[PDB]
Design a protein around this motif. Structure first.
Motif, PDB file in Angstrom:
ATOM      1  N   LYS A   9       0.825  -1.197   0.000  1.00 18.53           N
ATOM      2  CA  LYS A   9       0.000   0.000   0.000  1.00 18.53           C
ATOM      3  C   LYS A   9       0.867   1.257   0.000  1.00 18.53           C
ATOM      4  N   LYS A  21      -0.566  10.823  -1.485  1.00 17.98           N
ATOM      5  CA  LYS A  21      -1.687   9.958  -1.137  1.00 17.98           C
ATOM      6  C   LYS A  21      -2.805   9.940  -2.165  1.00 17.98           C
ATOM      7  N   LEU A  22      -3.044  11.043  -2.870  1.00 21.05           N
ATOM      8  CA  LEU A  22      -4.178  11.123  -3.781  1.00 21.05           C
ATOM      9  C   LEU A  22      -3.898  10.498  -5.143  1.00 21.05           C
ATOM     10  N   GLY A  24      -2.499   7.225  -6.037  1.00 23.37           N
ATOM     11  CA  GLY A  24      -2.900   5.845  -6.200  1.00 23.37           C
ATOM     12  C   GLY A  24      -3.156   5.114  -4.901  1.00 23.37           C
ATOM     13  N   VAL A  25      -3.445   3.821  -5.003  1.00 22.34           N
ATOM     14  CA  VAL A  25      -3.708   2.986  -3.842  1.00 22.34           C
ATOM     15  C   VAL A  25      -2.491   2.153  -3.466  1.00 22.34           C
ATOM     16  N   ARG A 251      16.445  27.976   9.102  1.00 26.99           N
ATOM     17  CA  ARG A 251      15.503  29.070   8.903  1.00 26.99           C
ATOM     18  C   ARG A 251      16.229  30.352   8.521  1.00 26.99           C
TER      19      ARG A 251
ATOM     20  N   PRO B   1     -10.528  -0.253   0.208  1.00 23.93           N
ATOM     21  CA  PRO B   1      -9.217   0.390   0.089  1.00 23.93           C
ATOM     22  C   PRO B   1      -9.171   1.380  -1.061  1.00 23.93           C
ATOM     23  N   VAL B   2      -9.844   2.510  -0.899  1.00 21.09           N
ATOM     24  CA  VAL B   2      -9.923   3.517  -1.930  1.00 21.09           C
ATOM     25  C   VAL B   2      -8.940   4.639  -1.614  1.00 21.09           C
ATOM     26  N   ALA B   3      -8.705   5.507  -2.595  1.00 22.05           N
ATOM     27  CA  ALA B   3      -7.737   6.596  -2.468  1.00 22.05           C
ATOM     28  C   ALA B   3      -8.496   7.904  -2.267  1.00 22.05           C
ATOM     29  N   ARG B   4      -8.845   8.190  -1.011  1.00 21.18           N
ATOM     30  CA  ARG B   4      -9.510   9.437  -0.652  1.00 21.18           C
ATOM     31  C   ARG B   4      -8.726  10.150   0.444  1.00 21.18           C
ATOM     32  N   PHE B  71      11.266  29.100  18.411  1.00 21.78           N
ATOM     33  CA  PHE B  71      10.944  28.907  16.999  1.00 21.78           C
ATOM     34  C   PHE B  71       9.452  29.074  16.736  1.00 21.78           C
ATOM     35  N   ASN B  74       8.407  32.776  17.292  1.00 18.29           N
ATOM     36  CA  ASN B  74       8.858  33.637  16.205  1.00 18.29           C
ATOM     37  C   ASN B  74       8.052  33.395  14.936  1.00 18.29           C
ATOM     38  N   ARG B 132     -17.588  39.735  -8.958  1.00 19.44           N
ATOM     39  CA  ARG B 132     -16.328  39.639  -9.711  1.00 19.44           C
ATOM     40  C   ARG B 132     -15.888  40.988 -10.286  1.00 19.44           C
ATOM     41  N   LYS B 138      -3.643  41.228 -10.138  1.00 15.91           N
ATOM     42  CA  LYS B 138      -4.095  40.533 -11.353  1.00 15.91           C
ATOM     43  C   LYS B 138      -4.681  39.157 -11.041  1.00 15.91           C
ATOM     44  N   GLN B 139      -5.649  39.133 -10.125  1.00 15.38           N
ATOM     45  CA  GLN B 139      -6.334  37.891  -9.769  1.00 15.38           C
ATOM     46  C   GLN B 139      -7.731  38.251  -9.287  1.00 15.38           C
ATOM     47  N   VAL B 140      -8.749  37.859 -10.055  1.00 17.44           N
ATOM     48  CA  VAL B 140     -10.124  38.224  -9.734  1.00 17.44           C
ATOM     49  C   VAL B 140     -10.600  37.423  -8.531  1.00 17.44           C
ATOM     50  N   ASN B 142     -13.710  36.854  -5.879  1.00 16.29           N
ATOM     51  CA  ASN B 142     -15.150  37.047  -5.756  1.00 16.29           C
ATOM     52  C   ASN B 142     -15.694  36.581  -4.410  1.00 16.29           C
ATOM     53  N   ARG B 161     -11.914  43.510 -16.738  1.00 22.86           N
ATOM     54  CA  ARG B 161     -13.154  43.181 -17.425  1.00 22.86           C
ATOM     55  C   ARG B 161     -14.374  43.845 -16.800  1.00 22.86           C
TER      56      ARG B 161
ATOM     57  N   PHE C  61      -8.647  30.463 -12.563  1.00 22.33           N
ATOM     58  CA  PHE C  61      -9.669  31.427 -12.187  1.00 22.33           C
ATOM     59  C   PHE C  61      -9.156  32.836 -12.447  1.00 22.33           C
ATOM     60  N   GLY C  62      -9.903  33.601 -13.235  1.00 25.81           N
ATOM     61  CA  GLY C  62      -9.493  34.956 -13.541  1.00 25.81           C
ATOM     62  C   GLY C  62      -9.581  35.311 -15.009  1.00 25.81           C
TER      63      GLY C  62
END
Lengths: 262, 185, 124, 37
Positions: A9, A21-22, A24-25, A251, B1-4, B71, B74, B132, B138-140, B142, B161, C61-62
């Motif tokens: 796995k 992780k996203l 494959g299995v 850092r 056993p899925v990939a989520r 650390f 800061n 919008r 330069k990034q819309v 909304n 626009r 997006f944009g």
RNA sequence: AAACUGCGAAUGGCUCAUUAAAUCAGUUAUGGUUCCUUUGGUCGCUCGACUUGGAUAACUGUGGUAAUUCU
RNA sequence: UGGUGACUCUAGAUAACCUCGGGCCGAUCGCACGCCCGGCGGCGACGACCCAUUCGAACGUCUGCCCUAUCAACUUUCGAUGGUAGUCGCCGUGCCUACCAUGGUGACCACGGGUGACGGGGAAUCAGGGUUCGAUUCCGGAGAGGGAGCCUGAGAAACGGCUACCACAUCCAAGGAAGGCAGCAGGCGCGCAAAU
RNA sequence: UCCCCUGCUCGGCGCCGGCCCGAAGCGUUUACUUUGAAAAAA
């Protein structure tokens, strides 16, 4: 289970394979080889992630069996071959050679090397074996059996072998003051000098290694590899020189690089 | 056993007192003053402020000359002065506990569009954001809940626009002009 | 007008192509079709447009930023060797057999039910 | 290959055995010297 | 195409019925045993034909049962 | 000879054995072509007794689990505890035989019973301490109606392998034949409760 | 805050059989306390 496993796995993979992780299995389970399942790097993961020569699992297969990858001077066709430690990965097409050495953290990194340094390989013997007619033998850490070695080779010392002939050229004795580099555990890839070794009968003999900036750390004897005689290494160390810098100064280095780069 | 992923967390918290006069009065004052929509947004602002205060308290519990405390303090202080809730003068770990809700709600995109000098009211600013018009570098964007930083403060402007910043006319103007041309021709 | 800019450009001697990341800038207009990027890379690198393979174009997006990949081969047969079949189907170079999986599985089972030379005539 | 490798190992073993013999001889001489003095 | 041969079908997938020092977890040992495959070694180390033998497939043809991946 | 903290370790030598149900010591295949007067040749595939290596597996050591005393003594020539000698097993071992001695555990809770008990990494609540859950995507264990037995193979007491029993059950020209969705879709029942 | 109030057989920062240092070998046992290793991922 009624037999040996064949799948692996993605989340059961080691961190130094260092995947996501996203995607494959299943993870690429390496075939059986000179090195173990954990501290090995498959050729597919190296060619697909570290060099970005392929995008999918089939292009890397075509690269691997088009006879362009030289592992220890020999061509390998298996896509999940375990490319272990101090293994020389050479590509005769693009004319670039690599050596797998741990960096300051616990991971493998690419290390472009000169071709003439690729002619030799360092390896550490595991045990002393006498053959069937009094032939001494060496069993290195990559299971490379050597017939008729030097009589001064001990049990926990390293040797320098040639990739073409296959015989031993020269060796380093495991002695106090030689340059060392750990190969497992929490301390991984740190360049240090051997300073003390205490023996425990029937247990693991912890040694004391001193870092090149005065720092001190201790690991087990099985996680100890010798790379040089005295303080001068026999191989070209990567960036950072195995120093294991802590969080505050890295850092500071990152913010200095961000200020200079902009 | 899925990939989520299966990783999520609640961003707000419901109060223990459902009916308290002073709490409802203060929450409605915040909603009216800072142009909110409901109580869940001010509750999530309270929740992230509570998380920041709890982290600061846990950091202040430990003694000095500690690398972990130094650390993390800061990093937290640099992030808070990057967002725009503090300044360089009050650069201390024990000054975090004096921060309030309106210091976080001042850094909202809706309030900054209202108070920068290009919108009439805060509700008009939220309506103008949601349709919008307002872009940052330069990034819309909304959405009104966009926490701007200090280095991106002087780059709030109408989009290319949008008709307000120079662009093609809208649907009502074009339809009315078509009606006028049809009636006059 | 529409302009593109390359990014993360690299050459691959051992696979006979070149990888790149394409940043399409189309302000005002919509997302341009892939033949425009193909002919633009053709007249950018001075190459016949039959070996330009581009895919994975997602509009940001944009309204005007589009990020996509691109493969620049040095030959047509070399591009025929190391390429997935669906991209060659998209360029009209490869054709797939049109049979669903259920018919193939049922035909395999029907050939499994009988032995000998009759497997040739039990599944047409 | 077996014959030449065995001959090379025999030469190396002879050299190492000669070195070990002279080391033991000088250690016996050192022991006699410290016994006398 | 078919068929003989070799390899794999002991992996993956589903469920929690039994199980209360049993399972499992951390630490240890096999100096008390087996190990497909990969990798390396050994493979003229034995002191005594310039290629041997007949059986079965696939195939051709003759059938039975109402019926089977039957013979 | 060489090594371990430690051998009845590895190696050496002497004298033999060496299973016809038989350990090895190549009667296999492709490409490129040949030098020197028929011999002599490079690069691979397959197979192979043995020894390491890799994925393991297996038996072990120490410590750690819910309730119940309306369970106070439990086990034992039907092995319970230990000794010896063997059979079997891949190996140690009452695992099992033959002969011996009466041992072994228990208020620090054994033994007997119950669980709407798979264990763990974890989850919810949460000042500080705690309480409840964990069938559920990763690790390990167990089963394929439930018991029993086995062939092949390195690896199975395997069930999308086989052989009988009981319960249910399909076709049948009534002599016989073929089976096990706690896999993916789907159906019945069960229900407050769960999709192509 | 800084160093001090457990013993003898092999041998190296050195000086001319005499002195300091190192070390194959062991030191009345428990808990408590501090450091170090190793302790899969999510």
């Amino acid at each position: 289970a009624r037999g040996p496993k064949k799948h692996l796995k993605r989340v059961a993979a080691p961190k130094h394979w260092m995947l996501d992780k996203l995607t494959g299995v299943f993870a690429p389970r390496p075939s059986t080889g000179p090195h173990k399942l954990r501290e090995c790097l498959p050729l597919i993961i190296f060619l697909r992630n570290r060099l970005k020569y392929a995008l999918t699992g089939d292009e890397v297969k075509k690269i691997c069996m088009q006879r362009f990858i030289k592992i220890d001077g020999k061509v390998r066709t298996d896509i999940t071959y375990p490319a272990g430690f101090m293994d020389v990965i050479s590509i005769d097409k693009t004319g670039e050679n690599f050596r797998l050495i741990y960096d300051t953290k616990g991971r493998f990194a690419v290390h472009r090397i000169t071709p003439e340094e690729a002619k030799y390989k360092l390896c550490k013997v595991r045990k002393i074996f006498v053959g069937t007619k009094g032939i001494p033998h060496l069993v290195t850490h990559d299971a490379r059996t050597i017939r008729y070695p030097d009589p001064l080779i001990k049990v926990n010392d390293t040797i320098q072998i040639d990739l073409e002939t296959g015989k031993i050229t020269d060796f380093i004795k495991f002695d106090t003051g030689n340059l060392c580099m750990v190969t497992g555990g929490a301390n991984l890839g740190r360049i240090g000098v051997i300073t003390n070794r205490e023996r425990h009968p029937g247990s693991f003999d912890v040694v004391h290694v001193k870092d090149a900036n005065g720092n001190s750390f201790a690991t087990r004897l099985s996680n100890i590899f010798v790379i040089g005689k005295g303080n001068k290494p026999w191989i070209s160390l990567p960036r950072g020189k195995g120093i294991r810098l802590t969080i505050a100064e890295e850092r500071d280095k990152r913010l200095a690089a961000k200020q200079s780069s902009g | 056993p899925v990939a989520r992923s299966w990783v999520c967390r609640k961003t707000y918290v419901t109060p223990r007192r459902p009916f308290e006069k002073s709490r409802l009065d203060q929450e409605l004052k915040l909603i009216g003053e800072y142009g909110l929509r409901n109580k869940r947004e001010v509750w999530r602002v309270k929740f992230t402020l509570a998380k920041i205060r709890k982290a600061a308290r846990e950091l202040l519990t430990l003694d000095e000359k500690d690398p972990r405390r130094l650390f993390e303090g800061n990093a937290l202080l640099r992030r808070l002065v990057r967002i725009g809730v503090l300044d360089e003068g009050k650069m201390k770990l024990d000054y975090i506990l004096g921060l309030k809700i309106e210091d976080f709600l001042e850094r909202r995109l809706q309030t900054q569009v209202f108070k920068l000098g290009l919108a009439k009211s805060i509700h008009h600013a939220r309506v103008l954001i949601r349709q919008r018009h307002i872009r940052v570098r330069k990034q819309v964007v909304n959405i009104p809940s966009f926490i701007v930083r200090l280095d991106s403060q002087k780059h709030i402007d109408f989009s290319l626009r949008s008709p307000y910043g120079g662009g093609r006319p809208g649907r009502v103007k074009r339809k009315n002009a078509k009606k006028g041309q049809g009636g006059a021709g | 007008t529409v302009t593109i800019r390359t990014r993360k450009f690299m050459t691959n001697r051992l696979l006979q192509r070149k990888q790149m990341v394409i940043d399409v800038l189309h302000p005002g207009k919509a997302t341009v079709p892939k033949t425009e990027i193909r002919e633009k890379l053709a007249k950018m690198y001075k190459t016949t447009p039959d070996v330009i393979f581009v895919f994975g174009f997602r509009t940001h997006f944009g309204g005007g930023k589009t990020t996509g990949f691109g493969m620049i081969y040095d030959s047509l047969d070399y591009a025929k060797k190391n390429e997935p079949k669906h991209r060659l189907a998209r360029h009209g170079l490869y054709e797939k057999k049109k049979t669903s999986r259920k018919q193939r599985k049922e035909r395999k089972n029907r050939m499994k039910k009988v032995r000998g030379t009759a497997k040739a005539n039990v599944g047409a | 290959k077996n014959k030449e490798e065995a001959a090379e190992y025999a030469k190396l073993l002879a050299k190492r055995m000669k070195e070990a013999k002279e080391k033991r001889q000088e250690q016996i001489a050192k022991r006699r010297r410290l016994s006398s003095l």
